[PDB]
Structures are given as C-alpha cells and as structure tokens.
C-alpha cells in the first residue's frame, strides 16, 4: 500500500484562483503562521529552574562508579577481573595481591573517567554487584589529574551514599 503525496493541481475555478491570488496578494496564510506562534506565546513555558529543581531521572540511570561493600563488612569486590574483561574502553586496571589474613584481595582498582563510556557492562558483569553505577552526575573537574580514580576514591565515593544504591538495587534485583 502506497499513500503518496502531491498528485493534485490547483483547479482553474474562478473562486479557486481568486482565493489563491488572495493568499498571494494579501499574505493570509503567513498571518495564520503568526497566529500559531502567538498561540504558543500565551502558553505557560515548559522550563525547569535547574539549581533548585534538578531534572527527573529513572531508578535505572547510570552514574557515578562507586564501589560498595557488605552490610557492615569487607569490600564486596574480590578482584576477579571481569570488569576489565568486559570493560570496552578498558578503563579498569586491576592488580590483586592477597592480603595478610589469607583471603584474596586487591592492590589497585582504577577507572579512567576520561575513558569510561558508561555502559554498565561492569554493572551487568560484576558477579557480586560490587561496582555499581550511582545516581548523580556532578564531577565538573578542573584538573585532568583528578579524573583518574583510585580505590580509596571509589570507596569514599561508596561511603558518600549507600541508601541511594540500596533503593536502586532493591529496585533492580528483579529485572537485572
């Protein structure tokens, strides 16, 4: 089925040609466009004041790159390197010593916020849900030094909130 456009000519009836000539010589449909944009003048504007009203989001937004931990416990990461194995921009750098008490751990867990493309493949891939995208998007960094995160930056970033990520993981242990 094809419903095509413009197979029609302006018919040569005298009223048709004088109405089209009145459109020409009297600018009528132009003034109709003026009336359209004035109808949008008198509307109420659809803006939001930013620094007092932040914009809406989802529970499934992808944010901040924090490390979590157990409920009053140890670091939920294990250094199992999956997040580097699926990180497409390869911004994850992991080096893993085992600690003193026999359990396996890290030395160095680094993200390049310059390099990260914010997919959450590490979110879909961390087998214990340690590294989780956060809610917020406010870095605005003055330096190119600060945008290379280390393990203590990520753990302090996880210290800056849990109850947010608690509500998000409670909203997303069902779909993902």
Site for ligand SF4 in 65-94 (CB under 6 A): 77-83, 86-89, 91-92, 94
| Structure tokens belonging to residue 124 | 């879909």
Rg (CA), the chain: 29
**Residue ranges in 41-70 that form contacts with ligand SF4 under rule CB under 6 A:** none
**Residue ranges in 35-64 that form contacts with other proteins under rule CB under 8 A:** 35-40, 42-44, 46, 48-49, 51-62
Q: Is 31 in the site for other proteins (CB under 8 A)?
A: no
37 binds, among ligand SF4, other proteins, none (CB under 5 to 8 A by kind): other proteins
14 binds, among other proteins, ligand SF4, none (CB under 5 to 8 A by kind): none
Residues 30, 143: contact at Cβ < 8 Å? Answer: no
Which residue bears the tokens 């590490």?
Answer: 122
132 binds, among other proteins, ligand SF4, none (CB under 5 to 8 A by kind): none
Residues 131, 77: contact at Cβ < 8 Å? Answer: yes
Q: Is 113 in the site for other proteins (CB under 8 A)?
A: no
For residues 84-99, one letter each, b for 16 or more C-beta atoms within 10 angstroms of the residue's C-beta and e for the rest, the string is beebeeebbebeeeee
């Amino acid at each position: 089925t094809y419903k095509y456009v413009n197979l029609r000519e302006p018919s040569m009836d005298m009223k048709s040609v004088t109405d089209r000539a009145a459109q020409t010589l009297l600018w009528t449909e132009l003034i109709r466009g003026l009336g359209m944009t004035l109808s949008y003048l008198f509307r109420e504007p659809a803006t939001i004041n930013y620094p007092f009203e932040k914009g809406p989001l989802s529970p499934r937004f992808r944010g901040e790159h924090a490390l979590r931990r157990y409920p009053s416990g140890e670091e939920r990461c294990i250094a199992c390197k999956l997040c580097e194995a699926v990180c497409p921009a390869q911004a994850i750098t992991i080096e893993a010593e085992p600690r003193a008490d026999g359990s396996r751990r890290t030395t160095r867990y680094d993200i390049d916020m310059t390099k990260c493309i914010y997919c959450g493949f590490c979110q879909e891939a961390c087998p214990v849900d340690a590294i989780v995208e956060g809610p917020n998007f406010e870095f605005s960094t003055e330096t190119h030094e600060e945008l290379l995160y280390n393990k203590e930056k990520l753990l302090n970033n996880g210290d800056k909130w849990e109850a947010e990520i608690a509500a998000n993981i409670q909203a997303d242990y069902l779909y993902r």
